[PDB]
Amino acid sequence: EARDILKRPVITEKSSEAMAEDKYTFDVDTRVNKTQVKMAVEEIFNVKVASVNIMNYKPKKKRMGRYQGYTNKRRKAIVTLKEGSIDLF
Amino acid sequence: AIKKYKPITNGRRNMTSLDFAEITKTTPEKSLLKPLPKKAGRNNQGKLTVRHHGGGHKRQYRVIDFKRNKDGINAKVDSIQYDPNRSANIALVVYADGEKRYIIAPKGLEVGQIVESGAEADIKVGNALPLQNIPVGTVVHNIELKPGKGGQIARSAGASAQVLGKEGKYVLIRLRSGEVRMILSTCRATIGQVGNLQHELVNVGKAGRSRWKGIRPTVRGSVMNPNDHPHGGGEGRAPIGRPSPMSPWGKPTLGKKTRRGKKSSDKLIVRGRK
Amino acid sequence: VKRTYQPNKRKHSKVHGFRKRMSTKNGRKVLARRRRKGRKVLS
RNA sequence: GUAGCGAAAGACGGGUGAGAAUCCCGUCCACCGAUUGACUAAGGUUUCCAGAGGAAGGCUCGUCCGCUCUGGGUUAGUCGGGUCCUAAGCUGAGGCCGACAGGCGUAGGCGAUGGAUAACAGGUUGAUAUUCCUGUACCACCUAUAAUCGUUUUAAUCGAUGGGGGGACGCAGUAGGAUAGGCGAAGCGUGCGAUUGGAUUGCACGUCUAAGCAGUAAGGCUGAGUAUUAGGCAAAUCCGGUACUCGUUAAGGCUGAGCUGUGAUGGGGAGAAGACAUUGUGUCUUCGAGUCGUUGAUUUCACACUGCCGAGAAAAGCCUCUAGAUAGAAAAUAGGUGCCCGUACCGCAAACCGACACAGGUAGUCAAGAUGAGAAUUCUAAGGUGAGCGAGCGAACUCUCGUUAAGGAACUCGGCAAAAUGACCCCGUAACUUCGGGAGAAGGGGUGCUCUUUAGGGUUAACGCCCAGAAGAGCCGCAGUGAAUAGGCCCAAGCGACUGUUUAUCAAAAACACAGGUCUCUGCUAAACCGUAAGGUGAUGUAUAGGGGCUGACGCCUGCCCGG
């Protein structure tokens, strides 16, 4: 743990408008809580977290050439650290 | 007394009611109440077994002391009260230590009156005694069939039974039906007649009032079809085309007796009617 | 005008549904049938 | 190349484009308006937002789309749910019954549609917001902080698997007391018309949350204190009976109580344009512009009070008191810490149920102005929409609508349908009645505008401010509730007493119910009924009760036959 509950960052215009502030958006494991998320980012990036909000996204239906299905459900977190930065690109 | 309403409405023409004058407290005691949900004539299988029971006004159950065990501790009558679960009114009494109970209200009971239970007690209205210690000739109510179980006979409005004699360990007693019976001399009973005597004189006036009291309608067999009743059928109005009137479940219902033989009480009964 | 099947998720999953089928021996038989037939959904 | 293209007002200009009645923008016009409006549940499940697209779908077209492709979008200590309580019901170890399967049932457990429970204003996106940002608060847990109880029995506090109170409740009606909304006007802001006239003259405006300081408008109170104990499975300093002192005063002693004034906030935004070089001058970096004053006032105080019978949940949270418990807690500060699920979008519908982008159905909340008793009626703000095939001609026939000379039911099974009546005020009104009624009986009459007033509801201060007390005097018209909306009436026979209910989808009735009668059964493990039984209903009822049969308000009555 502490490096497997965080999987990917999210890069969008909204996430970048957030990164203009101290807000950073991640995609995490579907079974973990915001407390685990906070402890994990503090352990990894060596920063101090203020708040962490979180949401669950449903599976989206998809089609591709007579083969329909569902995407994977995903859990998104938004952390709002007090001071510090993260060298993303 | 009984009040007659004026005939402002065709549903109020010949309709009567009670005054509720002998009621002196129109609010019950919080502690002696329990819930009473409606069964609507439906058993543990959820099936309708008795007809004509349904949804009337909501009620709470007043817990009554039919067994007058509190011996040697006189109690003072605190109030008379209305009971929806019953035709007779009830009396809230308070014992010397503060324990309070409900009893059935007899005819000539009054607030402040004193009432006691036991063999040492005296023959006054409201008092409970064993039948051994009650003298012959007097009227009683709330009689036990088995000692310590509680009153089962003479509980309704205006009900009374009178002692007639004394056997070895039994006493002869005459009931409101005209039946005489043998009751154990240890079985308890209360002195006096039950109150609310005018309860039998009300004219209910309108169907909605029966619906409030929880009576659904009854529909006659002669206007059913044959698959539903023995009297069903006929091209128009028809008479009872059988030798005897019959129930909906295929049994005689006029004059045929239904008590079953080989009961223990068959010998304790000496003269019976109805 | 009013039509049959006024849907309800709770009642659907309560009168149908896996636990309700498994609560009775005959409801355990419809599952065995759907498994044997190869049904993708059992409840 | 026929029937049909699913209720409804569109017109023009400009633009985009290969291509336009159908797409975008603009002006005008029109429609819904107790709704074609705005929210919230259920249900649906990405239909949401940007770009791109015209093969298929769209009842035409299509540059458009709830369609296709690509990529994005749902942020909570306080919102609704679970970590709380229980109702009906469902399961139910032991246990009962039973060919098997299995059925029932005790403690218990599960279970909201109920109870308990801490957050408000402003800003901001293409798409979320009481969730993000700002500000100001509130509610719990933990840790340090130290003045207070200092055997720890007791003690504020710990305190029961303990107790008592409370939560905790119906229906209708009445009266008030505040408040949202709403309102005349010179506080003050604002711009002055072009077709004649006028210039107090047109039109508007006057604000603002949760929380915390003070009090408060009325409501309830055998209202305050002493003594004792057959009790609260054991304990109690709390509950209950009784004997006394101030006694029915309500001072204000007491619990509860709508709401009001300062700060919150000289912050926000502000009828503002005066601020632009720009942000297409739309907008905004800068600096103020009213927080005045009358009239009448849903919801809330609380089922408060009053009355009525049909006599109107439970448990927990909570409040007090406890034997035993422990040093020993607290609070008031400062720190921290506050998990999980949902949140997009449609939502009285093009996304739900209906085979459909179906004239149907779908629980709840809010709902302005004029007219009026009114949520009726007609028009209209705000908001939403112009409805998803069109252009012409104005034949027969069919449907919907209006008007028709003379006559007036002659039509027809039948005055079916249509016509007529219709509001408010006044005058008057029969038979017959169970004395309630009938009765809105029938039948007549009146209603506009202007000036006088003597004067009523008074706006009342008073004629003025609205209706008038409504009395006179006038004016106009074919017509004065000038539109819309708003009872046809009488006489006499049957049936059924009445209100009600009935064949979802050809029968709403004289058929069923009914309240009242009567007969019969049943002495309580009652009879009766369900079930193989166990267990249940009847009934936590007990002959003034319960079941069954017939009859069917009320009044006068209810005859003969017991041979079968």
Numbering used by the authors:
A (entry chain R): 2 to 90
B (entry chain C): 2 to 275
C (entry chain 2): 2 to 44
Could you share sentences copied from the article?
The NPET, which is lined mostly by the 23S ribosomal RNA (rRNA) chain, initiates near the PTC and transverses through the large ribosomal subunit (LSU). Four ribosomal proteins (rProteins), uL4, uL22, uL23 and uL24, of which the globular regions are located on the ribosome surface, extend to line the tunnel walls.
A focused refinement of both large subunits resulted in a 2.4 Å and 2.3 Å cryo-EM reconstructed maps, respectively. These maps allowed for the unambiguous assignment of ery within SAuL22m_ery complex structure and for defining the interactions of ery with the rRNA nucleotides at the binding site including the identification of the nucleotides that bind ery via hydrophobic interactions as well as its hydrogen bonds. By inspecting the structural changes that occur upon ery binding to the mutant ribosome we could identify a cascade of movements. At the ery binding site, nucleotide G2505 rotates almost 90°, forms a new base pair with C2610 and is stabilized by another bond with U2506. U746 moves together with H35 by about ~3.0 Å to form a bond with OP1 of C2611. Due to such cascade of events uL22 ß hairpin loop shifts to the tunnel wall. Upon ery binding, an additional groove form in SAuL22m_ery structure. Thus, we suggest that the uL22m new groove widens the tunnel in which the nascent protein can pass and bypass ery’s steric blockage.
